[PDB]
Design a protein around this ligand. Structure first.
Ligand code: FMN
Ligand code: SF4
Lengths: 1004, 1005
C-alpha cells in the first residue's frame, strides 16, 4: 500500500487540522448568525435576565487567580523603582518585591512581604478597591494591555501560605519573654474585633507586648469582613485564618462584652489597671430615615445592618453557633443607595431568591459612590439602576409593603441638589433595603467614651498622625474615626496607632523609643532555617553571590550588594597594568531568544564587554576595604593574564596580598580554539603557576565552548585548583536587522564580533556542565553560573553538585534586592521538605486541582464525564446543573499547624542528590512506557495538543468538532509533545501503559 | 588615598530612589496617604464628575488601538487555535489564527493579505467591529484570567502597516490576460450605493475578472455611513479612502450624483441600457421619526441623527467634501433619544461641538441597551448621563429655541409589555434635542425604482438569505437595506455572498457553468510575484524552507501533507540499517524552561531524548520513491546514520540514493572509539564523508553538532572528505532541569531516570547563527543548510544573510503546525520586496520606524507640550489636557494616495546570501574611538525606572530619576554599555547616539 498516504481512519482523525485555503470562504450572514451562539463564551448583550443565583455563594470576583494565571501576570509587572503602586497602597506594601517573589515561584517570600505590612493581607487582596488605590497608580496603565492585577496577585500568594499551614512566631531577635522589661507586660485593651483592632493588636504583639485583650460585642470576630461582606466576595475561612495568625502571638479575644455605659467604659478600664486602650468599634448603627418609621422585616423592610448579617450568618459556616436559614426574599426588591453597601445588598438579594432587583439613587450614574469593579458585579447580575429619585413614602397595604413613591431630583447652578415635588414615580416592590451608610448613635456608647473630645461629625477626635484621642492613653482607628472607608485604611489606622501606643506605654514606664518609627516585620519558623554552606574551607553565610560581571563593575556596587545580604561576590576580572583594556560600545544587548518581549525577565543578554577597565591597584585596595568592613562576606578576586608564568604569579600574589578570600582564574585570554581555557594542557599549566604562587584557594572559570568540559575541569584539578566555576558565557550572535547589520553595531562601519550569551537561555548548558563535572569529579567543589534567577533554579544547581550559586543576568534584569527573595525562597524550599502532609507539592506549588480560570470546578455527580465544555449551549446546561445543586443543598442544611516530622535539611544535605537519577540512555527502561491523559474539566479547547500530535507526532488525538474536547486514543506513544505545548498547567498528565507497547515500524 | 569602594556624595544622591531591602514595616498615616495618592494617579478618578474638554477634539478614542510593541505581545499570547471559534464567529470568516500567527512572526504583509482576502474593508472593520458580540465573543482565551484576544486591535494594526507601505492591489496573477477573457466578463454590471455592501460586492466581482463594474452613488462623497456618520474619532476618513482606492486598483468605476429613483436610475432604465445585473446597496437612507417632533427645526435646536452626524463629519473629515465647513455650534444641554450605536455617537460628537452636558434618554432600562458595552463605555467615560424609562411627550419652545422636553415614565408588565404612566412626568431642561431612533427606507420614488421586486412584511426588498437574489433573478441586494444585520462586517459579507451568485447568474446568461464549490479569489499585490526560489549544490528549491529531520518528519505521510501545504523541501527522520534499529523511551520531549513559567504558544525551546527513526529503511526508501513520484519539484533529502564502519555507510547510502532521494544528509550523532560522537572528531568525519562519496553520485551534506570546541575544523574535514555542504547545526546537549525534590524531567520508569538530551528552538538560535557565520567565513561558498530556532521569515533571512542557502525548521512546527509555511513564504517575499522601495528605507524590515506614542497612539506634536516635563499621570496629566484642549480651540479659530514603485529590481535570495558577513570581524576591528551614549525620549517613557535600576546595580550610576515626575535623564557619566536600552519595556524609547563629549575610560586609580 501507499506508505506515504494516511489510511481513511487517520484521514478522519485529521479532519479539523489546519490547512491553508486557496480561496476566500463563502458563508451567508444568516448561517453566521445561527452558528454564532454555538461558540459564545462571554455574556450575551441581548440576554436581559440573570442566571439562577439562589443560594449560590460561589466566588464572583473577576480578579481571582490560579498559579498559571498568577505567574504570567507577576512576570508582566515591570517591578518598578520608587513604584507608584506602593505609594498608593494605604499600608505601603512593597508590591515590587512581593510580585518579584511570585514570578520567582517564591510564594512564601511574597506572603511574608505582604503580611509584614498588612496583617489582613488575604482579606485585602480579595476586597481592596484597587482601581481607587494601588492599581490606579500602576505604570502599566500606560500600555494597551493596562495595569497589573495587584489584588489577585496578593490573594494568590496569601492563599498559598494559608494552605502551607505555617504559624506566625515571635520576632527571633526580641529578648526572651522572661527578659522583656516590665513595660511590655502592661495591660492593653482594644474595643471591637474588626480590621483596625486586629491590626493594632498584631503590631503591638510583634513589638513584644504580652497582655493584649480585644473586647468584642458579638459572639463572632472579624467585624464587617464577617458580618456584612458577602461570602461570595470574602470567604469566612479567610477571616478565621488571619485571626488565628494573630492569636499565634498571644492576643486574647473575649466575646460578648461591650463598650457601653453599664458595661465596659474608659473609666472602668482605668480602674482595672489597663494602661492604654484602642477604640476600633466601627459605626454600629444604620443611618435611617423617618419615612421608614416603624416598618418591620415582616412587612418587607430591612436596613442594610439588618439584612447583610442575616445572609452572612447563614452562608458563613462557623460565623456563629446556630445554624440560621437564608432569608425568605421573594419578588421585586428595591435597594436604596449607591455605595459599596447598596451593591452588596443587591447581589445578596439575588442569593435569597429575589426575582428582580432595583437600585435607586438620589443622583445620577456619574455620581455613584462605589468603585466601578463593584458596580460591575451588580450590572452583570442584571440589576436595574434608577437614577435621580428620592424616596418619599412607603405604601403599605394589607400589612405588606407594595410600593415606594419617589420624587425626581435635579442639580442646578452651584450644582445644588433639589427635589421636584410635582414629578413623581410610583415603583412597585415587595421588599425594600436601605443602604444609606452607618453612624454611631447609641448614647450609652458615646457616654462610655467619656471624657474624650468629639468633633463636628460626632466621632472621636484624633490626631491624624498619632491616632491619639484627647485622653493620651486612649487611641482610635478605623470606621469610628471616619476618615477610612476601606479595610486597608482601617488596617493602616491600627498599625499607625500601634507605634504611638508603644511610645506612650514606654514613656509611662520611664523609657524612650527610637525617633525613627520601627514596626517589626512578619516572621515564621521558615525564617530560622539555616542556609549557610562551607566549600573549599570557606564559610558562606548563604550560597548566593554576584558573578564576575557588569553588577561588579565597581567596588561600591559590591559594597551595596553586601549591604542587601549577598553572601559573596567576585570582582570584575582585572589584569596587570600592561594588559589594560578599553571597552567599545554599544556592548550589551537584549537576547532575541524568546521573541519580541521587552522589559522584565529578558531570557538572555549578549555582551562584547572585555575585562575590567579599572586597574589592579583599584581592585586590590578595594578588596582590602571590602574585607575589612564585611569580614563575613566572601570576596573573590577574578584575574586574567596572558599565557605567561611570571605574570600569573605576579597578579595572583598581588590579589592574595590584598586580603581576597579566594581567586577565580578567567581563562578567556587567547594563547582547540583560540582561548587558553579551551586547551587542557594550558589549563593545567596556568593552574600550576597559580597554585605555587598563593596559599589561598583558587577556582578555574571554565568555558562551556568545548567538546568536553570534563577534560578541562580535570586539568584544573590536576593543576591544583580547589574547585572550578561552571560556566562562562556561551559563544553566540544575537541576530541581525532586516538590512543585514548586526546588533550590537560599533562605529561608522556598523561592525561587530562574536559575543557571550548569558541568562536563562543558557541554563540547560550550564546544568549539564555542572552535573557532568560532579559525576566525573565527586567531591571537587563547583561554583555554578548560568541562568540562576530564583531560589528554585538555585536549588537545581545545588542538587546537581554545585555548592554555591553565582548570579549576573538576574540582577541586570532587576537590582540587588532580589537576594532577599532568594534567601526566603531557599529557606521555604528546605523547610517544606520536612512537612509530611505537603509531600504532594512541587516545591512551593500545591498540586493543581481542576480549575476553570483558577476557580475550583464544582465536584458534582451530575456533571462529571458528561462532556460539557464551558461555552455555548453546553455552558448553559452547566449553569443549570449547578443551579439545581445549590437548591438541592439548601434542602440538606479547625486551623491546626503542620509541625516538621524530620530534620530540616542543610545545604550540605541536598548537594548532589539529583545525580542518582542521571545516567546513560541504556539505563532508561523501554518497558515502562507512558501515555497522555487529558483532564477535560481543565481544557480551554484550543486544540494545540491535537495540532502538535498531527504535524509533529502520531495523529493519536481526536478533537470533537462540536465540543472541541480532545481525547488521547490508544495509538499514543508517550512522546509527551502534547503535554509540552498545552497552555494549562497539568491539564495533560502522562500515566503508565496498561496495554502492551509495540513500536510502529512502518514495514516489518 | 580615599575610600575607593564607597560612593561619593554625588552618587549617593543619584542613588536616592534606587531600591533597597527594608528591614522594618513602613509607617505612613492614612491622611498622608490620601494626600499622596492623587500625585500618582493614572486612571479615571472615580470622584471626578465631568470629563475633560473635548471641543473640536477628533483624536482617536478607541480602547482597542495597538502600536507595534503592544501588538507583538498580544499576537504572541493568542493560542492560534485549531478550527478556531473566533473565526466561526466572524461574519466574513477571517482566518484569525493565520493572521495573528503572521503578526507574531513580524509578517505584517501576510497578515494584511490574509485579512483583505476575506474582507476588503479589513482596516475599517478592525476599527469599528463590535467584537464582543462577534469574533472575540467566541475566543477560547476568555477561559483564562487575562481574557480574550484584542482581535480587532490586531486586525487594525496589520492593516495600518499595510496602508503605510503603499502597495496596490493587482488583478489575480494566474487569471488569463484581460484581452483573453470570455465575453461574459465584459457584462455590464451596476451597483447602487457606494457603502460597505457595494464596495465589497464590486471588489469581489473584479477579483473574478469582470471588467465593467460601475457603482452609482447618490452623494458627492463615497463610503456610505463609514464616511457620513461614524465619527472621525472612531474611524478616520483616510481609512475609508485607502480601501476605496484599493478597490479602484481593480478598475471598479464610481459615479457620484446619480440616484436610484423615479425619473433617474431605475431597474427599467438599467435594463434598457444593457446592464446585465444590479446590486442594491443603498442602505436605510432616512431617519426614523416621532410625530411628537414634527415641525421642529435646526434653528430651534432640533436634529435627527441623519441631519446631525453628517454635519459633524463634513466638518471634521479632511476632504470628505471639497466644502470647508464649521462645526455645528451645540451649546448648553443636549438630550439624545435612543439606545443604539447611533445615539452614543450623537452623544460623544455633541461634546466635540461644545455641549456643556449630554443626556442619553431611553424608552426602556439600562438592561435593554442595544449598543455593545465597548460602545456604551465611550459615552460613560466622557460623563454622559443616562436616563432610563422615559418616553417623550412634549417639546417646549420659547423665544424660538427649545428650552425643555417633557417625558412620561415607562414601565414593564406582567407579560413584558411596555406601558406608559400618564400621571408620572419628567420635565427635563435642555437646549438641543437629537433624535437617534435609527433609520428607515421610506421614499416612495426610491421604492418605485425597484419595481417589480417583491417587498416583505417590513417593506424591505426580499432576498433569499443564501444567494442574496431578489425576486428578479438579475437583481441582488445586501447590506443595511436587507434588514438582517447592522454591522459593517455583515454588510461586507452580504456583498461577498452576492458576488458569487451574481457571477453564477451572469455566467449562466452567457451559457457557461460555474463550480459547484464556491471559489472567491484571494487578495493579491505585486509582493506576491516575488521569486523566492534558490539553487544549492545543483538542486533547485522552490522556496528555501524545509522540514528538518525530526518530530514533524516522523511519518512519510506527514511530509506529504507538508508538501501539500507548500514546504520547499523535507528531510526523513534519520534511519539506519536493520541491524541498527532502535526503540524509543517515553516521556521523551519536554518543553523548555528557558523563558520561565510560560505555557502554551511559542515555547522558547524543547529538550528531547528521542533516538533515530523507529521505522525501517525499507519503509523510508519506498516512501522517498512515492514522495518523489508525487512531488517531483519538492526536494527530499534522506537523513541516514551508521556506526563507524565503511561497508555500512556505503550500503545504506546506496540504498537511499537508489530510492531516488535528491540528496543525503549524514547524521554524525553515532558513537565510536574530541567526544564520543563521530561528528565530534574531524578525522572520522573526513573518513565517513570519503566513504559515502565513493559510494553515491548524488549530493550529500554532513550534519554537524554544536557540541564541539571548533565547528569549523569539523566542517572543513567534511569538505575535504567530499561532502557537498553541511547542515549546521544539530541540537545542543543540555539538562532541562529538575523538580524541587531532585527528580528530572523527563523521567523514565519507576526509577525516575534521565540522560542528557538535545535543546532545540529559539533558545539555541544564537549558537546556530554563530556556527553558520563562522563556517561561512572560513569556508566561503561551501553550501550551508541552516537549522536552529528559525521560526519566521525575518529570522530565516538572518541566516541567509549569514551565509546559509536553505533553512530547516523543527521547533516552530512543534509549536504550531505545517501551515506556518504560508506565513514564511509571504513574509520572505515582502522582506525582499521592501528592499526595492526608496520611500521605506527608515523601516527595519516590515516595521515602520517607531514614532513617539503612549499606549501606541501618537503624541500630539504641539510645541507648548514639547519638553515641559509633564509625564502622563497625576497633576501633570491634567496640565497636558489643558494644553491639548487650548490647541484644539486655536485650530477651531483658524479653519493624494499614489503607490510607491520599486526603483531597484527586487533582490533574489542568491543576492542576499552572506551580506551580513562584511560586518563581522575580530574584536580589534571595532572602533573604541567611535563611542555612544544613551538618550531617552521622555514622550515615550512609562516611568518605570528600570533603566535607572539597571544602570545603578549593573552599570555606571549615570541616570537621574526624578522623584516627582519619575522621568529618567542620562547624564555624562554614561559609557554607552547599552544595558538600559536592553531592559526598557518601550521599543525605541531609548536610542544610542554618537558621543559628542570627551570619552575617557574610568580607571578607578
Ligand atoms: C524530537 C526531535 C527529534 C529530532 N530528531 C532528529 C533526528 O532524528 N535526526 C537529526 O538529524 N536531527 C534531529 N533533531 C534535531 C532537528 O533535526 C533540528 O536540528 C533541531 O531541533 C534544531 O532545529 P529547531 O531549532 O528548528 O528545532 C531532532 C529534534 C527534535 C526536537
Ligand atoms: S493592600 Fe490593597 S491596596 Fe495595598 S497593594 Fe494591596 S491591594 Fe493594593
Amino acid at each position: 500500500p501507499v506508505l506515504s498516504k494516511d489510511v481513511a481512519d487517520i484521514e478522519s482523525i485529521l479532519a479539523l487540522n489546519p490547512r491553508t485555503q486557496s480561496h476566500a470562504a463563502l458563508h451567508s450572514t444568516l448561517a453566521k448568525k445561527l452558528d454564532k451562539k454555538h461558540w459564545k463564551r462571554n455574556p450575551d448583550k441581548n440576554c436581559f435576565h440573570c442566571e439562577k443565583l439562589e443560594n449560590n455563594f460561589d466566588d464572583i470576583k473577576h480578579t481571582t487567580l490560579g498559579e498559571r494565571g498568577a505567574l504570567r501576570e507577576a512576570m508582566r509587572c515591570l517591578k518598578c523603582a520608587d513604584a507608584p503602586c506602593q505609594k498608593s497602597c494605604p499600608t505601603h506594601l512593597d508590591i515590587k518585591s512581593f510580585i518579584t517573589s511570585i514570578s520567582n515561584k517564591n510564594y512564601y517570600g511574597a506572603a511574608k512581604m505582604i503580611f509584614s505590612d498588612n496583617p489582613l493581607g488575604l482579606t485585602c487582596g480579595m476586597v481592596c478597591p484597587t482601581s481607587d488605590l494601588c492599581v490606579g497608580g500602576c505604570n502599566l496603565y500606560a500600555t494597551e494591555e493596562g495595569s497589573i492585577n495587584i489584588g489577585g496577585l496578593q490573594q494568590f500568594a496569601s492563599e498559598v501560605f494559608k494552605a502551607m499551614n505555617i504559624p506566625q512566631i515571635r520576632n527571633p531577635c526580641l529578648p526572651s519573654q522572661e527578659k522583656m522589661p516590665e513595660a511590655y507586660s502592661a495591660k492593653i485593651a482594644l474595643l471591637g474585633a474588626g480590621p483596625a483592632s486586629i491590626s493594632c493588636a498584631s503590631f503591638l504583639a510583634r513589638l513584644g507586648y504580652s497582655d493584649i485583650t480585644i473586647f468584642e460585642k458579638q459572639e463572632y470576630v472579624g467585624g464587617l469582613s464577617t458580618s456584612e461582606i458577602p461570602q461570595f466576595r470574602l470567604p469566612y475561612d479567610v477571616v478565621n485564618f488571619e485571626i488565628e495568625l494573630m492569636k499565634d502571638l498571644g492576643v486574647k479575644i473575649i466575646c460578648g462584652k461591650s463598650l457601653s455605659e453599664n458595661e465596659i467604659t474608659l473609666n472602668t478600664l482605668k480602674e482595672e489597671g489597663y494602661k492604654a486602650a484602642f477604640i476600633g468599634i466601627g459605626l454600629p448603627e444604620p443611618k435611617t430615615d423617618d419615612i421608614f418609621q416603624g416598618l418591620t422585616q415582616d412587612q418587607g423592610f430591612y436596613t442594610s445592618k439588618d439584612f447583610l448579617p442575616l445572609v452572612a450568618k447563614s452562608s458563613k459556616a462557623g460565623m456563629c453557633a446556630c445554624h440560621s436559614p437564608l432569608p425568605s426574599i421573594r419578588g421585586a426588591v428595591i435597594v436604596l443607595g449607591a455605595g459599596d453597601t447598596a451593591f452588596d445588598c443587591a447581589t445578596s438579594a439575588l442569593r435569597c431568591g429575589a426575582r428582580r432587583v432595583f437600585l435607586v439613587f438620589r443622583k445620577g450614574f456619574v455620581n455613584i459612590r462605589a468603585v466601578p469593579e463593584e458596580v460591575e458585579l451588580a450590572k452583570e447580575e442584571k440589576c436595574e439602576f434608577l437614577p435621580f429619585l428620592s424616596p418619599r413614602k412607603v405604601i403599605v397595604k394589607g400589612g405588606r409593603i407594595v410600593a415606594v413613591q419617589f420624587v425626581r431630583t435635579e442639580q442646578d447652578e452651584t450644582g445644588k441638589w433639589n427635589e421636584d415635588e410635582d414629578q413623581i414615580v410610583h415603583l412597585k416592590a415587595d421588599v425594600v433595603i436601605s443602604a444609606f451608610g452607618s453612624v454611631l448613635r447609641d448614647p450609652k456608647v458615646k457616654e462610655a467614651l467619656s471624657p474624650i473630645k468629639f468633633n463636628r461629625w460626632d466621632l472621636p477626635e484624633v490626631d491624624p498622625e498619632t491616632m491619639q484621642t484627647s485622653e493620651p492613653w486612649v487611641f482610635a482607628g478605623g470606621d469610628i474615626v471616619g476618615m477610612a472607608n476601606t479595610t486597608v485604611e482601617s488596617v493602616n489606622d491600627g498599625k499607625q496607632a500601634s507605634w504611638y501606643i508603644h511610645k506612650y506605654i514606654q514613656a509611662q514606664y520611664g523609657a524612650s523609643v527610637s525617633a525613627k518609627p520601627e514596626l517589626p516585620l512578619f516572621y515564621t519558623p521558615v525564617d530560622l532555617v539555616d542556609i549557610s554552606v562551607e566549600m573549599a574551607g570557606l564559610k558562606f553565610i548563604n550560597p548566593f553571590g554576584l558573578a564576575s560581571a557588569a553588577p561588579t563593575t565597581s567596588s561600591s556596587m559590591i559594597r551595596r550588594a553586601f549591604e542587601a545580604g549577598w553572601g559573596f561576590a567576585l570582582t570584575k576580572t582585572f589584569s596587570l597594568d600592561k594588559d589594560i583594556v578599553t571597552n567599545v560600545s554599544p556592548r550589551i544587548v537584549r537576547g532575541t531568544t524568546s521573541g519580541p518581549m521587552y522589559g522584565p525577565g529578558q531570557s538572555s543578554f549578549l555582551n562584547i564587554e572585555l575585562i575590567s577597565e579599572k586597574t589592579a591597584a583599584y581592585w586590590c585596595q578595594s578588596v582590602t576595604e571590602l574585607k575589612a568592613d564585611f569580614p563575613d562576606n566572601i570576596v573573590i578576586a577574578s584575574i586574567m593574564c596572558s599565557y605567561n608564568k611570571n605574570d600569573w604569579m605576579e597578579l595572583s600574589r598581588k590579589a592574595e596580598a590584598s586580603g581576597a578570600d579566594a581567586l577565580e582564574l578567567n581563562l578567556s585570554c587567547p594563547h582547540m580554539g583560540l582561548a587558553c581555557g579551551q586547551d587542557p594542557e594550558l589549563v593545567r599549566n596556568i593552574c600550576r603557576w597559580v597554585r605555587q604562587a598563593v596559599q589561598i584557594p583558587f577556582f578555574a572559570k571554565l568555558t562551556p565552548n568545548v567538546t568536553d568540559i570534563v577534560s578541562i575541569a580535570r586539568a584544573a584539578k590536576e593543576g591544583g585548583a580547589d574547585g572550578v566555576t561552571a560556566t562562562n558565557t556561551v559563544s553566540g550572535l544575537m541576530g541581525l536587522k532586516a538590512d543585514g547589520t548586526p546588533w550590537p553595531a560599533v562605529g561608522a562601519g556598523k561592525r561587530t564580533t562574536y559575543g557571550g550569551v548569558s541568562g536563562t537561555a543558557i541554563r540547560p548548558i550550564a546544568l549539564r556542565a555542572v552535573t557532568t563535572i560532579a559525576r566525573a569529579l565527586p567531591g571537587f567543589p563547583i561554583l555554578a553560573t548560568g541562568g540562576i534567577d530564583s531560589a528554585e533554579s538555585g536549588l537545581q544547581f545545588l542538587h546537581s553538585g554545585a555548592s554555591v550559586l553565582q548570579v549576573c543576568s538576574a540582577v541586570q534584569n532587576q537590582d540587588f534586592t532580589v537576594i532577599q527573595d532568594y534567601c526566603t525562597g531557599l529557606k521555604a524550599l528546605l523547610y517544606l521538605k520536612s512537612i509530611e502532609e505537603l509531600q504532594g507539592w512541587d516545591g512551593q506549588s500545591p498540586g493543581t486541582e481542576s480549575h476553570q480560570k483558577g476557580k475550583p470546578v464544582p465536584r458534582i455527580a451530575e456533571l462529571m464525564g458528561k462532556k460539557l465544555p464551558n461555552f455555548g449551549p453546553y455552558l448553559e446546561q452547566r449553569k443549570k446543573i449547578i443551579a439545581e445543586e445549590k437548591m438541592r443543598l439548601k434542602e440538606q442544611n479547625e486551623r491546626k499547624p503542620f509541625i516538621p516530622k524530620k530534620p530540616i535539611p542543610a545545604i550540605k544535605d541536598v548537594i548532589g542528590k539529583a545525580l542518582q537519577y542521571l545516567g546513560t540512555f541504556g539505563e532508561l527502561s523501554n518497558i515502562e512506557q507512558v501515555v497522555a491523559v487529558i483532564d477535560e474539566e481543565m481544557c480551554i479547547n484550543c486544540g494545540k495538543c491535537y495540532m502538535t500530535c498531527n504535524d509533529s507526532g502520531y495523529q493519536a488525538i481526536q478533537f470533537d468538532p462540536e465540543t472541541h474536547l480532545p481525547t488521547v486514543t490508544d495509538t499514543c506513544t508517550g512522546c509527551t509533545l502534547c503535554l509540552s505545548v498545552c497552555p494549562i498547567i497539568d491539564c495533560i498528565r502522562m500515566v503508565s501503559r496498561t496495554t502492551p507497547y509495540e513500536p510502529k515500524r512502518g514495514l516489518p
